[PDB]
Swiss-Prot record:
SUBUNIT field: (Microbial infection) Interacts with phage T7 protein Ocr (AC P03775, gene 0.3) during an infection and when the protein is expressed from a plasmid; this interaction inhibits the enzymatic activity of PglX/BrxX through high-affinity binding. Forms a 2:2 tetrameric complex with phage T7 OCR.
A biological-process GO annotation: methylation
Superkingdom classification of source: Bacteria
Originating gene: pglX
Free-text function comment from the UniProt entry: BREX systems (bacteriophage exclusion) provide immunity against bacteriophage. Part of a type 1 BREX system which protects against dsDNA phage. This system allows phage adsorption but prevents phage DNA replication, without degradation of the phage DNA. Methylation of bacterial DNA by this protein guides self/non-self discrimination. Methylates the adenine in the fifth position of the hexamer 5'-GGTAAG-3' in genomic DNA; methylates the same sequence in the few phage that escape the BREX system. Methylated phage are now resistant to BREX, showing immunity is provided by an epigenetic modification. Expression of this protein alone has no effect on phage infection, does not lead to methylated DNA and mildly inhibits growth.
Organism encoding this protein: Escherichia coli O9:H4 (strain HS)
Gene3D superfamilies reported in the protein's UniProt record: Vaccinia Virus protein VP39
Deleted gene: phenotype: No methylation of 5'-GGTAAG-3' in chromosomal DNA, BREX no longer confers phage resistance.
One Pfam family recorded for the sequence: Eco57I
Name by which UniProt lists this protein: Adenine-specific methyltransferase BrxX
Keyword Ribosomal protein belongs to the record: no
Keywords assigned: Antiviral defense, Methyltransferase, S-adenosyl-L-methionine, Transferase
PANTHER family: DNA METHYLTRANSFERASE A, DNA METHYLTRANSFERASE YEEA-RELATED
InterPro entries: BREX_1_PglX (IPR047939), DNA_methylase_N6_adenine_CS (IPR002052), MethylTrfase_TaqI-like_dom (IPR011639), N4_N6_ade-DNA_methylase (IPR050953), SAM-dependent_MTases_sf (IPR029063)
Induction: Transcribed at slowly increasing levels as cells progress from lag to exponential to stationary phase.
């Protein structure tokens, strides 16, 4: 495996070389501070010796360092360090690869010795290698060999000579002479501490058998640094630092073989080439008109030396390798001389641009090695490549021109250009040359932009001629002319390369969103690409067509976001008006092996250049598989689709590419009215979420508009919610008094104000499972996340009809197809289809009635009437069975109604549709599946359901005891602040059947000392509701139900002990969970020990509550505890032995509780000193922290640890 050897060594070594570079800088008086300011020491010249502080060197090296000084100021310090580091790394890797494969003339290892670790073959053949490299001074080297010492110097000299020899064959990688990096070459190569030994014996040689390993370097040597430049804003320097990957071979072969091979086969269908190309795609059938039109432009014959392949982003160059393979196959088929084939291919068949010098060097080396593998006589001819990297333009305008002395050699020295000197074309004009100035002016910020700079085609041919002249000046001119030509070559070369027109383009554009783009890049994108400015690859794809000529091709692999999203929507339209698809493979996630994360969802597509809307493309579906399975399925031609016309994509609104979609569905989409613009967007508040939004049960009924009359301070407001059908989620209240004067002060957004308080349908803007719409009566306000629907004053579309249509399977499927991201903005909803009928109205009415009846059986709804179990007088089990039967009947009725609606819609449309996830889910609390989620098996939710029912019964009984509920009348009894009016209700006899506590304080202890014990009142309530004869069996049943799932059953106890334990242990958690951390019953606990705990109703509370509670409870409890302690102490002397022991220990705990109680009393004393009065409108979360530690779980509610007095 590659990662076993190449990885775990490539990244670390990247830093190591850099360190050596720093060392060299320290030896040359070159340094930078923390801020990066230049700290270059001043050279001292004494005795032809240069000194930089302490270090010294011979005078001959002085001028070279001066160039480095320029390198210090022309660019960044770290830039130069990294440049030298990767240059040396690439050179060493290339030398190792060449020596291992034995392509050298002499055929001797340099970095190691065969069958002898830590040695050198050249040391055994010094005269031969010296003659091969340096015949002129070999004898002196032999003297060094005669010396036996200075082995390091001899090795360094041999390495430098080998590099100089290798310069000629690869001018783009090795320098001939006067290389500054020679001074930067690390010393002590012969010593074991040198990194050369690690490079030699850190990777097995068996990995050096294929070119593939080279590519891995391009993905590893920077990978570590990628981790430091990922997820942040990216500058120009770091543009390649986080957008370098590797591509699997099969994808590249699919891209290449279906672009050039198809063009070749169209001209010559009878050729023995399709057999070799395994990934070629057989075109589908076409109409005779399409065939006639296509055959009208197919060329009769194409010269082999006329095909152009261009790569805007080469990197490793494996795409170029595949192209070279295909072109070699074509040339061999034609019948040229075999060994002549490679060089010709490298002449006018490959072109590559990149933005990193390292990538260009790697690509050149890879191509040269691939060519060498087959041709033996390569490297003996000066073959010049065309894989280059862009260069910035900062040079003297005319000084280089003056040094050119063009008129002296041929012509055009002073004023002669391609045009006249004073032509003044565009803005560059011609101080010395027209074309030169025009070309140079367009590369001012080339490093910032890249391959996106456009060049006019008309200037192509002339440029070519100009290039030739420079080629005649590098060898047949004076020193000044040669250096000027060398300086000016790259700019003209890259301009001419960009100025051509090509046939096939293959590339893998880098991925970078809006965040990565800097200000300059973003403003350039906005200026140049209005329709694709969202992301880089969109601009890349749009611009790639600018270089293709007629009958071109574009093959690319990129993210699938442009397929559906509306941001690229216009782009999609522009594709469907002038282009013509050929093929597309949707890979989705789980592709790009050796890469963590499934966010990468990519597709590979091949698109023609001309326009023909009646062609039939070929698609594929390879989403749900692993890499090997995807490759096998593509090999086996799995999941094909050839039943779609290109023009049909323009009928679906939004123009989304949906290949797997049927045809009848698309046709039926058109002949149906749309929803129109009835949908509106809800209002929004700036930052007042916690200022006006509250839960309904925590405010006064008078302050509630829905419950109260006359004055209005609060209003319900729907907002979000989970999946829910036809009714629910009315659990948020907002403050809108005096037409939102406070909101207008807050400057909150207000939209469609005049249409408020109107009945209609509402849907959730941001969902996670699907789409659903719910009814809403009048007197409501809708949030921005609660965009609503309102029918016109006089139109045939009723709200019930729309609600019936929306929740059908057809609408859900269409919505899923349109927006696969589960996001529902107003605009997309505005273009939904809608049907018209009459039975749908009554069916929707019945569904709404059933849903509302289901929702009106819980305390969380203000429309609560009464508990279900108290309507049956037979028995507890009988009432439970009746309740279960009622829920089952509701479920069955809803299921039948949904089935009938679906059947009616399907028969109206006339074609069946598929079923998907959550297509038949029932959103009722009666359904155990929806209420309790999904488990491994059914039948588990019986004991839990019974326990929850009994818990609800106990909670209702507690609420009745508190006075909130009364059995005399239905609905809410008293929910007003300050307990005011309680005496009037007592006089009215609202609690006639069941007395209500006068002080609104519920003690909770383990003894029956208090006459108002919760347990005793519960027993009285049960005996009143269900009589006295069957009291014991009912209590046993309730205890069993509680022991089922609520708490672990105890070994031996009666019903009363179980009830008391459940109340003292589990009740608070259940209440908090039910009311979602906004409790209405406040618990005051003396401590963790059950010394004293009481419950208080929030509404009935007032200032006098605290002192009255303290006086009426703590002092009598203190007296009782003191008397019990005195009695126990008196009896302790009477008792003896173990009988006394159990009497003593508990006593301690008791007095411990007593002590704790005293402490609580002290705390109470503090709050007995001050009088506290609060308001509901302040906020329960706000007010809960006003009592210090008198409450429990204060951090859970208030969100922070409470203070202490």
């Amino acid at each position: 495996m590659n990662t076993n050897n190449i990885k775990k060594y490539a990244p670390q070594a990247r830093n190591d070389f850099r360190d050596a570079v720093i060392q060299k800088l320290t030896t040359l008086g070159i340094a930078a501070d923390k801020k990066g300011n230049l700290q270059i020491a001043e050279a001292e010249t004494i005795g032809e010796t240069v000194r930089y502080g302490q270090f010294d060197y011979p005078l001959s090296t002085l001028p070279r360092r001066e160039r480095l000084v320029k390198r210090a100021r022309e660019q960044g310090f770290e830039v130069l360090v990294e440049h030298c580091a990767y240059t040396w790394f690439n050179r060493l890797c290339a030398i190792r690869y060449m020596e291992l494969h034995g392509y050298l003339d002499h055929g001797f290892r340099m970095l190691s010795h065969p069958e002898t670790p830590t040695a050198f073959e050249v040391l055994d053949h010094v005269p031969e290698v010296a003659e091969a490299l340096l015949p002129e001074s070999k004898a002196q080297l032999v003297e060094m060999k005669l010396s036996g010492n200075q082995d390091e110097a001899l090795y360094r000299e041999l390495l430098l000579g080998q590099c100089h020899a290798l310069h000629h064959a690869m001018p783009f990688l090795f320098e001939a002479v006067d290389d500054e990096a020679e001074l930067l070459l690390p010393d002590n190569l012969t010593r074991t501490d040198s990194i050369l030994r690690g490079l030699v014996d850190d990777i097995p040689e068996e990995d050096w058998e294929q070119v593939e390993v080279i590519g891995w370097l391009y993905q590893f040597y920077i990978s570590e640094k990628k981790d430091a430049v990922i997820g942040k804003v990216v500058k120009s320097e770091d543009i390649p630092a986080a957008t370098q990957l590797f591509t699997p071979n099969w994808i590249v072969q699919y891209l290449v073989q279906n672009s050039v091979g198809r063009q070749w086969l169209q001209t010559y269908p009878d050729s023995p080439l399709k057999d070799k190309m395994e990934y070629y795609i057989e075109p589908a059938e076409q109409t005779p008109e399409v065939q006639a039109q296509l055959a009208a432009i197919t060329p009769a014959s194409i010269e082999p030396e006329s095909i152009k392949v261009l790569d805007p982003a080469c990197g490793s160059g494996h795409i170029l390798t595949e192209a070279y393979n295909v072109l070699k196959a074509i040339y061999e088929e034609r019948g040229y001389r075999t060994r002549d084939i490679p060089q010709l291919i490298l002449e006018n068949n490959i072109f590559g641009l990149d933005i990193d010098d390292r990538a260009a060097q790697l690509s050149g080396f890879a191509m040269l090695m691939l060519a060498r593998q087959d041709d033996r006589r390569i490297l003996g001819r000066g073959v010049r490549l065309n894989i280059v990297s862009l260069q910035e333009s900062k040079l003297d305008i005319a000084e280089v021109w003056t040094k050119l002395n063009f008129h002296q050699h041929m012509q055009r020295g002073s004023m002669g250009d391609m045009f006249t000197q004073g032509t003044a074309l565009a803005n560059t004009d011609s101080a010395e040359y027209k074309l030169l100035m025009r070309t140079l002016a367009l590369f001012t910020s080339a490093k910032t932009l890249g391959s996106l700079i456009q060049v006019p085609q008309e200037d192509e041919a002339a440029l070519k001629a100009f290039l030739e002249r420079l080629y005649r000046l590098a060898v047949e001119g004076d020193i000044q002319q040669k250096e000027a030509a060398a300086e000016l070559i790259p700019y003209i070369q890259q301009a001419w390369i960009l100025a051509q027109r090509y046939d096939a383009v293959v590339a893998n554009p880098p991925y970078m969103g809006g965040k990565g783009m800097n200000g300059d890049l973003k403003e350039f994108a906005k200026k140049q690409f209005p329709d694709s400015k969202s992301d880089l690859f969109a601009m890349f794809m749009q611009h790639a067509f600018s270089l293709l000529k007629e009958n071109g091709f574009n093959a690319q692999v990129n993210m699938q976001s442009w397929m559906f999203l509306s941001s690229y929507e216009a782009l999609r339209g522009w594709l469907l008006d002038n282009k013509t698809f050929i093929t597309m493979a949707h890979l989705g996630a789980r592709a790009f092996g050796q890469i963590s994360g499934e966010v990468v969802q990519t597709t590979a597509w091949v698109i023609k250049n001309n326009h023909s809307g009646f062609y039939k493309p070929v698609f594929f579906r390879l989403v749900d598989d692993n890499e090997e399975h995807k490759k096998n399925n593509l090999l086996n031609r799995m999941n094909c689709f050839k039943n779609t016309l290109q023009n049909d994509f323009k009928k679906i609104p939004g123009s989304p590419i949906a290949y797997w979609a049927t045809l009848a569905f698309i046709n039926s989409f058109l002949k149906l009215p749309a929803l129109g613009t009835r949908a509106v967007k809800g209002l929004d508040t700036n930052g007042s979420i916690d200022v006006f939004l509250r839960r309904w049960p925590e405010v006064s009924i008078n302050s509630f508009d829905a419950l109260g009359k006359g004055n209005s301070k609060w209003f319900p407001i729907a907002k979000g919610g989970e999946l829910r059908k036809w009714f629910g989620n009315h659990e948020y209240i907002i403050n809108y008094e005096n037409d939102g004067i406070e909101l207008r002060k807050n400057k909150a957004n207000l939209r469609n104000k005049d249409m408020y308080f109107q009945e209609g349908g509402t849907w959730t803007v941001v969902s996670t499972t699907g789409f659903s719409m719910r009814y809403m009566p009048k007197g409501f306000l809708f949030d921005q996340g609660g965009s609503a629907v309102f029918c016109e004053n006089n139109d045939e579309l009723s709200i019930y009809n729309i609600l019936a249509c929306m929740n059908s399977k057809y609408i859900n499927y269409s919505a899923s197809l349109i927006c696969p991201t589960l996001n529902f903005t107003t605009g997309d909803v505005r273009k939904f289809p809608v049907i018209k009928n009459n039975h749908l109205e009554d069916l929707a009415k019945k569904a709404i009635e059933i849903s509302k009846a289901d929702w009106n059986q819980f305390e969380t709804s203000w429309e609560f009437s009464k508990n279900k179990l108290i309507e049956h007088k037979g028995n507890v089990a009988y009432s439970y069975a009746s309740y279960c039967n009622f829920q089952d009947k509701l479920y069955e009725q809803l299921v039948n109604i949904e089935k009938n609606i679906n059947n009616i819609i399907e028969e109206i449309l006339g074609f069946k549709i598929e079923t998907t996830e959550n297509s038949e889910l029932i959103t009722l609390n009666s359904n155990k599946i929806y209420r309790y989620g999904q488990s491994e098996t059914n039948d588990t939710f019986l004991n839990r359901h019974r326990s929850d029912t009994i818990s609800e019964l106990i909670s209702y009984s507690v609420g009745c005891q508190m006075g909130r509920y009364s059995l005399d009348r239905e609905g809410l009894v008293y929910a007003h602040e300050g307990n005011k009016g309680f005496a009037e209700l007592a006089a009215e006899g609202a609690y006639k059947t069941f007395p209500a506590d006068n002080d609104g304080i519920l003690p909770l202890m383990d003894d029956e000392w208090f006459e108002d014990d919760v347990t005793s009142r519960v027993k009285e309530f049960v005996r009143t509701v269900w009589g006295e004869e069957h009291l014991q069996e009912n209590l046993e049943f309730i205890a069993e139900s509680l022991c089922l799932y609520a708490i672990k059953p105890k070994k031996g106890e009666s019903a009363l002990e179980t009830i008391r334990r459940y109340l003292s242990t589990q009740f608070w958690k259940d209440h908090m969970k039910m009311y979602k951390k906004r409790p209405i019953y406040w618990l005051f606990s003396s401590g963790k020990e059950k010394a004293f705990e009481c419950l208080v109703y929030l509404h009935r509370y007032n200032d006098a509550t605290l002192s009255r509670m303290r006086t009426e409870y703590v002092v009598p409890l203190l007296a009782r505890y003191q008397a019990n302690i005195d009695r126990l102490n008196d009896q302790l002397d009477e008792a003896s032995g173990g009988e006394a022991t159990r009497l003593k220990r508990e006593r301690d705990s008791l007095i411990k509780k007593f002590s704790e109680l005293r402490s609580y009393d002290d705390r109470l004393r503090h709050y007995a000193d001050m009088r506290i009065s609060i308001d509901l409108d302040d906020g329960v979360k706000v007010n809960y922290g006003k009592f210090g530690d008198l409450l429990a779980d204060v951090k859970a509610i208030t969100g922070n640890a409470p203070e202490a007095i």
